[PDB]
Design a protein around this ligand. Structure first.
Ligand SMILES: NC(=O)c1ccc[n+]([C@@H]2O[C@H](COP(=O)([O-])OP(=O)(O)OC[C@H]3O[C@@H](n4cnc5c(N)ncnc54)[C@H](O)[C@@H]3O)[C@@H](O)[C@H]2O)c1
Ligand SMILES: NC(=O)c1ccc[n+]([C@@H]2O[C@H](COP(=O)([O-])OP(=O)(O)OC[C@H]3O[C@@H](n4cnc5c(N)ncnc54)[C@H](O)[C@@H]3O)[C@@H](O)[C@H]2O)c1
Ligand SMILES: *C(=O)/C=C/C=C(\O)C(=O)O
Ligand SMILES: *C(=O)/C=C/C=C(\O)C(=O)O
Ligand code: NA
Ligand code: NA
Ligand code: NA
Ligand code: NA
Lengths: 483, 483, 483, 483
């Protein structure tokens, strides 16, 4: 497979290519052409020009119809996108079929609909002469949106940004993770086939520092940079755009906690924490890598989770009953296993997992690790405070509600939290005190696309979703008429 | 000993003081104690702790009531605030009495009221199991808000940030401009007398780089930094908070245009542009330093404006009929005069002004300049493209509507624009094509505090005002209940 | 052709039928089975029951998709719907193709989208015990919506009610005008073929008093009655539902004015008033039957409008260049002609029209009248104060802006007004003073479906459109959780 | 003591008067002049005129400040208002001090605040010529609001309607209950002393039918009628305004249930149903006259409530620990006692009360009744299906969740419901299935004034509160500008 850039209506190669590797077996899947600085310029300039072309003349209704046409395009190639997403990342086929590709479709449809329904405000005011004035606001395209996305939910996160950007009339220069370039490239094909005017959507491949990613953030021609990824990368991009004072929107992961209270449905909570720790092999920014369980049910909770975790099938994306594929790459697995070691050095008890499974086939050339549970670490351990981004959790007992709220909040991060309790007052009382952008009670990662999505502290800045995306991806302009 | 810091409920001095100069005559008004890094730490920690004190326990109704009491406290000492604002800045006593102090009181009242009325959102969704779920959002205090304000509308802009910060339940560490520290110090005494709990509002004095401003900016304990001032300082601040990924809100001035079309009420447009160019001696981020006038009325407009500008009385804040005071400082005076010279060098015709008036009294030791009108420069002239922040405007003819719209938008800034026209279609057609955050038609700087206020490009990031401030100064949290 | 009721998923006849007459030539088009009280009761009960079936279990997104399927079904038979609407009413084919059927399809799509995007409110509050409470609101189906619609824009107005009813999860019993039953019956076929569950949508044919309309109105099983038609009829319906305290929504026509100021674009105003007076042969609740024109342009406006009126082609629905078809029925024509003589008796100058065209072919057996302009009546003339609902307008001069505002507002109706002026202040200053639900400036009947649509005084009560429909066709419930 | 009408800024007598009776002892408190038809017309005409006077030139800020001055004026005479409401109704001094008078003050403050903060909508749209159009909406005063209020919470309910009416710029003609005219007459003095312009607020005394109530209702000069009281009276008023098609808003009582599930905090539920049944001697539209208790806790619950009920002190309004005053009147006690008898006829077990207390003093000439509890009635009994409006409740056991939901909903009414449960899923799952306007979980009659308030079925029409009031008491006008 060859994966090219898509710049100003055309697919183009580059001076340099890099390998896309399948993490299931270590095999080469494709050569990917790295955009250089010149090509990034070309994309941004094309994006700037396209804003003054046909795209800029479309009614909101026409624009929304075309975006639905994009989403029809993905649906018409549904299985091709499933296969591309699975090949890049090793994620289970059922996950790609139920979470990944459908969400990418729903992202475009949801924001296409919002572009049609959304309106703005009218404020009337008195003036000293008695004639009054009126202020009204409009939303306009911000301009060229730079989009930089990660490899953990490639098409979902890539379209989570591209859909609202296009729905708001912007043009886009978008750079997918070098680890998972395939579905974004098929998306370029869908755009092209749907007749999206040239320059409106541009796809550039490559890495971050000293590559397409960095060149994007440094380009004076963009009006905003939306990014999901590692928190320190957020800081770097924020510095990079500072001289342009570009608008920024960041979701930057975290060190999320699950809390299980004594009145929880215990079997429900065990299954739910199994899902929150090990979904996508723990490679969701929302995963619970810290878990607090009331002392009175701690042992029974830990025993039950150990049993469920050792029932997880780890293997081929299409394997019967598969629950976990590999990590995204050998590089990421190096990081995760170095934390597996660190946990033991910090004095953890390894409840289950802690290494890599032996398959006695090509999966041994892949990037698999075992689902892993720890117990016995202090709230200050590095494995309990630093984002690992693997299929792991540490479990600790607690006694008191105010105490556990403090321990959950005692973090430089604050993206998400999951709480288990059957008690009505506790759900609402505790949830509002957790210092994060997203709380789930008796579930996890349940998404209504209209809700504000973002984190606090090192976990991000701004919110996206619903009207928060409609506001971020638009110039909000106030027009005051003296009457 | 004159102007003290206010930290954790105590007025405190510092190791070093600096002079506050009266720009009317260059005399010393007061010594101001410069907060050092330790004192800035102390203020941030105290604000962090106050979030856990009784301030954090107030209901929204009680918090609002207390904010109204701060406003009452300003009103109670109205004329003292006027005298402080006038002493620091030389602004006309009438301006301080009508624009500055009332706006500051209205800032607290409007955001107190919005604190009580504002509400959030309820989203219902279906789920696989048929029982559904609820997402609802809440606003919570962001935490400690760092406020850095400029010297041009001292109390107005300082309260513009402090009022919504308090209304949203935050605590505050605020650093007013070294040039105009008096009214913010009186506001501290007002907070004290009102019984605002210690730590909730903290005042630190000093400069930017290597002083209280830089320190505030780099402190890990703040949750956001809101700033009004020069764009390049905005960029410095954006880099400073980047490692903490702190929320940011910037309004950074610009090079604003006024446009007068042939069908304007000519007398009103001349009066309007006289106000937009010379109010506060041209020291408002919203002033029109570039003016475009349809060729059919260009000479008449220039003639009329010249006559009106030369009627302006430049003098004492309590001078009979006074229109303009001095610039804020000799240092700012030097910048402005550097531009007055550059304008001649760039080939400008000096319709009026272009130097400093000769008063033959103590005003000669202050920082006055003349209101100045230029003509004959090209759209690329430095004097036409760089923010001067003085009482000056260049006037250029135009012929076509699409032409003038392009020349207005050909700028790295985009804060505000004023359009003069009596034509219904043109007003709405042209206003929506101007790439700024704020357009006024047939008026200027007419303010409804509910409206989104901010700029595009180098002129800012984000919006404040109304629900935009309620959002920026709050954590927006989403809570999802599985049923 | 025979037109059946549709009740509980089955097309059914009745003991009695009535004739559907083509107003172009007076010929019989169809027999229509009249629903009796007994069949009305079956529809209401089937609708109640359908709330507890599969319909009531659809997620909002699934309900919206099925509603888009209804719209797809109409589109798939677009030309059949065009032919049906034309046959019943005589409207020009081009109007059916551009206004009527497209708006019916748009009505369903607009409200299906609003069903997906709309959300409700979250209010937090403090309590005595310091634990606080939460109030959240939800939208639920009101229950069974009774829909009674008029003959002037049959499918347009029929679906304007049925679309939001269904979108909000209600079930429906709908009674279209006896003059225009055909497209409603086609809509019933589309609903059936789309798989809309039995009892969700019920179509009952008949008249008002002592027939289907009245019986629907009197049935205790409905939860609301939405109605567009004659004002006195709205009053009757309001009395009929009073004992059940049913929710009601009425749009009741009016005696709308157009105002042409001295600075109007005269040719555009002539064309605009031509359209506002004579569209659909003046059979729109929104038509201008009163026109005020500034004295300085009155003679030229009257002359220009006479020319354009006499250029209108009055003829067959598919005749080349046709502008106007007949009135809906002989009965309506008797009413209109009655007013035409009354105008003469009241002292009117007949500028043009005032009678019936003579075709010397089968159209003479139809229900045609001529477009008619009057001049010289006083503001108290009956022909200036009572809604005629034919292709007529009276034109009167004025001198003063406040004067004409008073004359427009001096009416027992207040549905719409159209104003013509090129002046920015005038447009906003005048529009806000007109006591109507809807003002247009320099256009007429330009519809954005998100806007509140409705009248004041005798012209209606309640608003529909956008969120106004979502609120009216829903129970709004507040749920207060003590924490 | 005399109570006059207040019309066009003047207190005026009438050709007739009637007795205001203290229900504690049947002693005459004052004579009340009964406005006649001529006087009502004079009030409506004065309110109509005042719309064009100084009231109507008020900015929204200035109008709100005057409204707050009205509130201040009530606070300034707080104890007098307390005394007037007690005298009229016999309510405990304590309830008047904490519930009635402060809520009346909060009603004006909350709507004055809303008046300042509320804004409207801007919708942009494409047009066929490519220039587009703008639709913006505005709120204007509806006109003259007719207000008719009941005697159970005289000032609270009088001001609940009057406050938003005035906050929206309307003028008011208000008719308080014949049983409780005092606090409203004091309000008129406050309005007057506050400088409220003549004609803005008019107070007319009298009864319903054939008196000031009915006359208001039939007057063609009002624009709306807002009413809280008996459901049949709402049906009467709806017919009365129907010929003018006036806007109507009704809150019409009900037969509200409380539901106590087995996992309720039993003690809390016992206390909560005590309050919900006997507050204001059960004369609240919101009281729980039907209570369902899970079978497993039924006997315990009844036992507990009997004991708490017999603890209640029934006596003088100022009497030591008084919990209950008398009924409002003798006529009303007759109605209630008649239900006490019917309960027995219908076969009910009297757990407690069921008659009148015996004082051996002036109170024996009052209108006291005992707090009563019944058991053993069927769901169809008249005592369990008809509004008594006394301090009575019937308690019935239930077994299943879906069962009790069906029984709660099996009512021609639907105002409020209180649910008791500690379970998170149940509380949300059950609350949304109750067919009422208002649900409380684990509390009762907890009021956030921003929330929508109203009932379904016979219990009302429309919603009031927050923006629902701002919309009902305003004309919503849409203004569409073609560009
Ligand atoms: N947007 C406005 O309203 C506004 C206001 C004042 C000045 N200006 C512009 O800025 C120019 C210079 O004036 P100025 O020097 O007072 O503006 P400045 O932006 O440098 O300083 C304004 C505020 O920022 C603080 N500050 C400065 N440097 C900082 C730093 N490195 N870190 C943290 N805080 C810092 C200052 O102490 C002051 O409170 C003017 O000529 C004008 O062009 C704009
Ligand atoms: N607002 C509008 O758009 C509109 C539309 C049509 C007619 N009108 C006015 O009404 C006049 C007469 O026309 P029309 O008789 O067809 O209008 P109408 O108001 O009497 O009837 C319209 C609809 O209401 C039904 N209806 C009539 N009486 C009823 C009753 N007592 N109970 C229940 N339903 C009833 C009809 O069957 C039809 O479906 C026209 O001349 C015109 O002035 C207004
Ligand atoms: C009345 O004759 C016209 C009604 C039109 C509407 O209701 C509409 O939505 O356009
Ligand atoms: C009915 O008896 C009580 C009504 C209460 C209100 O309307 C309220 O605002 O609290
Ligand atoms: Na890969
Ligand atoms: Na100074
Ligand atoms: Na017909
Ligand atoms: Na009484």
């Amino acid at each position: 497979s060859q994966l090219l850039n898509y710049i100003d209506g055309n697919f183009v190669t580059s001076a340099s290519s890099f390998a896309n590797i399948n993490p299931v077996n270590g095999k080469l899947i494709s050569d990917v052409f790295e955009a250089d600085a010149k090509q990034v310029n070309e994309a941004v300039v094309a994006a700037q020009n396209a804003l003054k072309g046909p795209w800029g003349k479309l009614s909101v209704q026409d624009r929304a119809a075309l975006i639905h046409k994009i989403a029809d395009g993905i649906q018409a190639r549904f299985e091709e996108f499933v296969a591309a997403e699975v090949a890049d990342t090793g994620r289970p086929v059922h996950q790609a079929r139920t979470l990944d590709i459908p969400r990418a479709i729903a992202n475009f449809r949801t924001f296409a609909d919002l572009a049609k329904t959304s309106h703005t405000d009218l404020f009337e005011m008195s003036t000293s002469d008695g004639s009054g004035a009126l202020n009204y606001t409009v939303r306009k395209p911000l301009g060229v949106i730079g989009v930089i996305s990660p490899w953990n939910l490639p098409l979902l996160l890539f379209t989570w940004k591209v859909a609202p950007a296009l729905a708001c009339g912007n043009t886009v220069v978008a750079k997918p993770s070098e680890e998972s370039p395939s579905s974004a490239t098929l998306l370029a094909e869908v755009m092209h086939d749907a007749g999206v005017p040239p320059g409106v959507f541009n796809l550039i491949h490559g890495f971050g520092k000293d590559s397409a990613g960095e060149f994007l953030t440094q380009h004076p021609g963009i009006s905003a940079l939306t990014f999901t990824g590692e928190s320190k990368t957020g800081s770097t991009i924020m510095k990079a755009v500072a001289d342009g004072v570009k608008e920024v929107s960041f979701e930057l992961g975290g060190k999320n906690a699950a809390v299980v209270f004594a009145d929880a449905d215990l079997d429900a909570a065990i299954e739910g924490v199994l899902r929150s720790s090990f979904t996508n092999s723990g490679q969701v920014c929302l995963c619970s890598e810290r878990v607090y369980v009331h002392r009175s049910i701690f042992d029974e909770f830990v025993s039950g989770l150990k049993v469920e975790a050792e029932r997880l099938v780890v293997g081929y994306p299409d394997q019967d009953g598969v629950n976990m594929g590999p990590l995204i790459s050998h590089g990421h697995r190096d990081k995760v296993l170095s934390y597996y070691r660190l946990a033991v050095d910090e004095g953890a008890t390894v409840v289950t997992g802690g290494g890599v499974p032996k398959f006695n086939d090509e999966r041994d050339q892949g990037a698999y690790v075992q689902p892993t549970i720890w117990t016995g670490l202090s709230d200050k351990a590095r494995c309990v405070t630093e984002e690992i981004f693997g299929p792991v959790c540490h479990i600790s007992p607690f006694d008191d509600e105010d105490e556990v709220i403090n321990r959950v909040n005692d973090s430089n991060y604050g993206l998400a939290c999951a709480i288990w309790t059957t008690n009505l007052s506790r759900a609402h009382r505790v949830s509002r005190q957790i210092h994060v952008g997203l709380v789930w009670v008796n579930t996890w990662y349940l998404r209504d696309l209209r809700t504000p999505f973002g984190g606090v502290k090192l976990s991000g800045l701004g919110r996206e979703g619903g009207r928060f995306s409609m506001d971020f991806y638009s110039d909000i302009a106030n027009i005051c008429i003296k009457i």
